[PDB]
Amino acid sequence: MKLNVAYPAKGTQKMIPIDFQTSMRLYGLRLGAQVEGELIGEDFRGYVFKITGGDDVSGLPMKDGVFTDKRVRLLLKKGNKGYRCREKGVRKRKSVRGCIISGEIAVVSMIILKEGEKPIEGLTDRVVECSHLPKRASKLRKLFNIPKDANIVEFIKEQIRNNSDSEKKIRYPRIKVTRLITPMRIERKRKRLEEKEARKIKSENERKEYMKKYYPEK
Amino acid sequence: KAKTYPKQKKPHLKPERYYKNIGMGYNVPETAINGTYIDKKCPFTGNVTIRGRIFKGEVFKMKQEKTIVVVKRYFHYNKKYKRYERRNTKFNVHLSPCFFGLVRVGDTVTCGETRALSKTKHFAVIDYKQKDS
Amino acid sequence: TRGPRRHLKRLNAPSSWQLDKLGGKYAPKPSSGPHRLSECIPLCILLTRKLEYATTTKELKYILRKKMIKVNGVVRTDKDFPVGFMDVISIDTTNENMRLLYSNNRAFMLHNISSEEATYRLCRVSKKKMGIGGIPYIYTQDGSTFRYCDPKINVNDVVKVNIKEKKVVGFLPFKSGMKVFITKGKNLGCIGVISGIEKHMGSHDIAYVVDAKGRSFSTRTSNAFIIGDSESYWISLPEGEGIKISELEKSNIKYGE
Amino acid sequence: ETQICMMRENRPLQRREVVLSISHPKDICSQISSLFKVRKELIIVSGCSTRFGTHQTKCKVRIYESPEMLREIERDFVVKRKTGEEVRKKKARRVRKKERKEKAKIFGTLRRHLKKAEKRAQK
RNA sequence: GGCUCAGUAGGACGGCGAUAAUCCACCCGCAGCAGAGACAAGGAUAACCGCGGCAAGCUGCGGCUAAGACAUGGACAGGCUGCGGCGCGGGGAGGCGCGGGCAGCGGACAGGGAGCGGCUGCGGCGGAGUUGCUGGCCCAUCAGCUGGUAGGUAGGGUAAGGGCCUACCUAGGCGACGACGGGUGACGGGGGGUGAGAGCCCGGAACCGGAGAGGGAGCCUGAGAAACAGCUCCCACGUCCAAGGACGGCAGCAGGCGCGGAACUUGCCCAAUCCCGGCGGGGGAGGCAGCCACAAGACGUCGCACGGCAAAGGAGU
Numbered sequence A: 001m002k003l004n005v006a007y008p009a010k011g012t013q014k015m016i017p018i019d020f021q022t023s024m025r026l027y028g029l030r031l032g033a034q035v036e037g038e039l040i041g042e043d044f045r046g047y048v049f050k051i052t053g054g055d056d057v058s059g060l061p062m063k064d065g066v067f068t069d070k071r072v073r074l075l076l077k078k079g080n081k082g083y084r085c086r087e088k089g090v091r092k093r094k095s096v097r098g099c100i101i102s103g104e105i106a107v108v109s110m111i112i113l114k115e116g117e118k119p120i121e122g123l124t125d126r127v128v129e130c131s132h133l134p135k136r137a138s139k140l141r142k143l144f145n146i147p148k149d150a151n152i153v154e155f156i157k158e159q160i161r162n163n164s165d166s167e168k169k170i171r172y173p174r175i176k177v178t179r180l181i182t183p184m185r186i187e188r189k190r191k192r193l194e195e196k197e198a199r200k201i202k203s204e205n206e207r208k209e210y211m212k213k214y215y216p217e218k
Numbered sequence B: 001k002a003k004t005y006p007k008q009k010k011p012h013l014k015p016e017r018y019y020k021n022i023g024m025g026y027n028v029p030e031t032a033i034n035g036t037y038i039d040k041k042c043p044f045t046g047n048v049t050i051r052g053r054i055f056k057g058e059v060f061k062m063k064q065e066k067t068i069v070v071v072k073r074y075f076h077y078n079k080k081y082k083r084y085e086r087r088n089t090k091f092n093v094h095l096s097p098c099f100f101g102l103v104r105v106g107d108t109v110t111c112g113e114t115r116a117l118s119k120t121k122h123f124a125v126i127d128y129k130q131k132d133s
Numbered sequence C: 001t002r003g004p005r006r007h008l009k010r011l012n013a014p015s016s017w018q019l020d021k022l023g024g025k026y027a028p029k030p031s032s033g034p035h036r037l038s039e040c041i042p043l044c045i046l047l048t049r050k051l052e053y054a055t056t057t058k059e060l061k062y063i064l065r066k067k068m069i070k071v072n073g074v075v076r077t078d079k080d081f082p083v084g085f086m087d088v089i090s091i092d093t094t095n096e097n098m099r100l101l102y103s104n105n106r107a108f109m110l111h112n113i114s115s116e117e118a119t120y121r122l123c124r125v126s127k128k129k130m131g132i133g134g135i136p137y138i139y140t141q142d143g144s145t146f147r148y149c150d151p152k153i154n155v156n157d158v159v160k161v162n163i164k165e166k167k168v169v170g171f172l173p174f175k176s177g178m179k180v181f182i183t184k185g186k187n188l189g190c191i192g193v194i195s196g197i198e199k200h201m202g203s204h205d206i207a208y209v210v211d212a213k214g215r216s217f218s219t220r221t222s223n224a225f226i227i228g229d230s231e232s233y234w235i236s237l238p239e240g241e242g243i244k245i246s247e248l249e250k251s252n253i254k255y256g257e
Numbered sequence D: 001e002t003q004i005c006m007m008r009e010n011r012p013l014q015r016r017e018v019v020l021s022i023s024h025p026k027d028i029c030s031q032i033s034s035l036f037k038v039r040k041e042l043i044i045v046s047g048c049s050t051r052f053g054t055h056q057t058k059c060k061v062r063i064y065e066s067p068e069m070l071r072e073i074e075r076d077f078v079v080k081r082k083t084g085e086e087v088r089k090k091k092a093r094r095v096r097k098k099e100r101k102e103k104a105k106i107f108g109t110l111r112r113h114l115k116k117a118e119k120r121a122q123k
Numbered sequence E: 001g002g003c004u005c006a007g008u009a010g011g012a013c014g015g016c017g018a019u020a021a022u023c024c025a026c027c028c029g030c031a032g033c034a035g036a037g038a039c040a041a042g043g044a045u046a047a048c049c050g051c052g053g054c055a056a057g058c059u060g061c062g063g064c065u066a067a068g069a070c071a072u073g074g075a076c077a078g079g080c081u082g083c084g085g086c087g088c089g090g091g092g093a094g095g096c097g098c099g100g101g102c103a104g105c106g107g108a109c110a111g112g113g114a115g116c117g118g119c120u121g122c123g124g125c126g127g128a129g130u131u132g133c134u135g136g137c138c139c140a141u142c143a144g145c146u147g148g149u150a151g152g153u154a155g156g157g158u159a160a161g162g163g164c165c166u167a168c169c170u171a172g173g174c175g176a177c178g179a180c181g182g183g184u185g186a187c188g189g190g191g192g193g194u195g196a197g198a199g200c201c202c203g204g205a206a207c208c209g210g211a212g213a214g215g216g217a218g219c220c221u222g223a224g225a226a227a228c229a230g231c232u233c234c235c236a237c238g239u240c241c242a243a244g245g246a247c248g249g250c251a252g253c254a255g256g257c258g259c260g261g262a263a264c265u266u267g268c269c270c271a272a273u274c275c276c277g278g279c280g281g282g283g284g285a286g287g288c289a290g291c292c293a294c295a296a297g298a299c300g301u302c303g304c305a306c307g308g309c310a311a312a313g314g315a316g317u
């Protein structure tokens, strides 16, 4: 049984092929349980894991919150763990596994919560980057401490050339910005506002003209 | 007696009793205007409207208090033989209490298409003519 | 079957469209716009069968892409847009303004009108209903709606509405002695003066009409479209002028009386 | 001997639709160009229609005003008749069906799907 | 759309109506869309970056990240319900529309530098559900049938009237003017055949309506399905497996087998006819060709160029 272990704060992840006698120490545990690395091996002393998911030698997922170790057939909607719903409102009956670990499980997914004493070269030494910087302007201005006046996509390309080390070729990352006050936004609101009052006086004009033409005394 | 307190519609526009004119060039009976009955299925003092076919038939059965069986006898022409056939259909017709005692077995009764009042009741007695008259 | 019918067979198409039997299996199903399907024709029939601007749908797509078609003063870049009776098709290329109208052969015909007659159209009212806040807005048979009209405008009246202005500029009532156009029926596409109105409480008011020639016929008032009062016609009349000459009159012109 | 039956002007489609009856008792578009001030490329004849006995072929030919409106408005096969553009390949109908039907079952990008496929094929 | 006609003898269909007993997407015409810090909107997730499980079908873990997705903000109106209640309009007929009331709820724009797009309501259009009257096969060696059956009251339920359902109560309801039951190698109709006609017979088959997707039942999503080239399960057949599991519904198009007397090519293409999509796309709908003396009609006793064709072939020189 392998051990798919990831580090969230480091973004690194590798498989740890533990031996058979380690696997029997992990039986009866469930998802969300936190195991100390002393249970796994001496090479993981001081670590704290958290079991997130698992898989099967038949390929099934290990569904969270079933509380069996056996293969169970469950009827899943969209967004339910263990079913990738393709068409709208289509429910299927998928086979999953309950959260309890047993001998049937091929791989156990877990994350590092607390870093142990000795480093793991794939997992502790490396740092793997966050794959995407935000699109929202409020999320970008807090991340780079951007001036409120300044152009956002300009201000980052300022910063890349500043902290570049004589690089003749610099490719930039994917920078698109959403949810920002722009002159197209302000022009649309003021136009919609002035038309709302223009409709009100025009409708009130046609009520007066109707009350003048066809009800002239009142 | 009654399961609910007997209540009529609020008369819009004897001004203490609700009664409407059903239209189609008909009249409200004075037993409906000056009456105390609270039949909700009545065409005049109740919650039904008359729309669709208005036919005239003869009362076949006056049993089973509020409904009556009205037979409409008609002729159907067989084109091969070039003769007619005497046919009929019986209708379960709602008889309002404004016609109680007025309508008896044999009278020619004009019935108007209401809602589906019961399972088999789609007509209500809107007027009548006595057999002796 | 059951649901919104997306297709339309060629034989099931209205015969006023004058589509042939052997043209294909399907006919263009109109979009569900302003006129009813029994009283409308699509744009795509007029631009290939009547005006023959496009012989192909590829040509027809180009004409509606470049937005040269404009009906009732709106561009209407839809292939299956239902144009109906009294609607004005105005194309700025060719400067051709036409009003859709019926013929004596019980078919739709595009009648060439002036540039000044294209500025308005006639609409028969459907109902008259007070809106929220007391706005008395009436509704026409072609799905248009106008507010703050004359209070004398009641049902079955035709109103002269401006095209370039959304208001109603002219009112024509439904009395006896009015020039009427027969929209649906056996006498479809006949122009006559209303002789009598029979009311028939409950259903189906009947209008009695004699034409200009003197031939008398009876129709439902729902099939009666007023086009003028006693002195004047509010629209131009098409070719043939709604006379509906008899079959013996067609016989007598070929061989003498 | 050529004679024009009817001459009609399609102003929205920037062309002239004319019907000609050509007769040969006992190549076509050349002398038609030697009637009006038009190039040979501006000449598109829809179809040649002939009665059985007489040598009187009827041609319905179009008179465009620009080569660009011609290749835009007219159908793609008739410009293959004049010049043989073949601007869109559109490989074959049976190839395009299988090419699209394979793409339909692929969730995600093709590169994630082909990588996971050969990674399992490598094992 | 296409296919098919098993079921269906009235849940159909046709004709004439009704919906004042009802719901609604596209589209069209109108009115409108909360100042809230507002030069403004919050947390996510897929894609993706990695790491995987698994024979296959399929699926997990981690990391980030969008909106016309999902929220927040903010109520002038429409709306709902109860009570009150005069009128003005429409309609054959009214608290149907609208104005005027008191309450309890509730409720429409924080979008974009290729055209705009959202949402609420009224009116259409396009649909749809119910429904009334009526007509249409055979058998009397089928003569009595009926218990939610017929009605009442009341509630429930529904988009909606209703024994539709329930509670209580009446004893009704239909029948030789043929009920009820049975049969049908019965989808109905527009129609077709045949006869001078009256008739008789047929309607699988172009169009319209219905019904079905191996037999069923249940449902999700959606405006609309009790959908089936959606799901869930059962049954009957069939397939793959590494034996843990995974699948199949040609009464779509060709094609195969079987059945029988009895019925064509696993051809080409969106060119025409049209449909879906907000356009470039897709369409075995559909067309073209091939097969067949199956039918209608016309006419006798071999190869270029031309011509047309999406392309080819045929017609025509």
Ligand SMILES: [Mg+2]
Pocket (backbone or CB within 6 Å): none
């Ligand atoms: Mg994930």
Ligand SMILES: [Mg+2]
Pocket (backbone or CB within 6 Å): none
């Ligand atoms: Mg995650």
Ligand SMILES: [Mg+2]
Pocket (backbone or CB within 6 Å): E186
């Ligand atoms: Mg059968």
Ligand SMILES: [Mg+2]
Pocket (backbone or CB within 6 Å): E203
């Ligand atoms: Mg049939």
Ligand SMILES: [Mg+2]
Pocket (backbone or CB within 6 Å): none
């Ligand atoms: Mg059919």
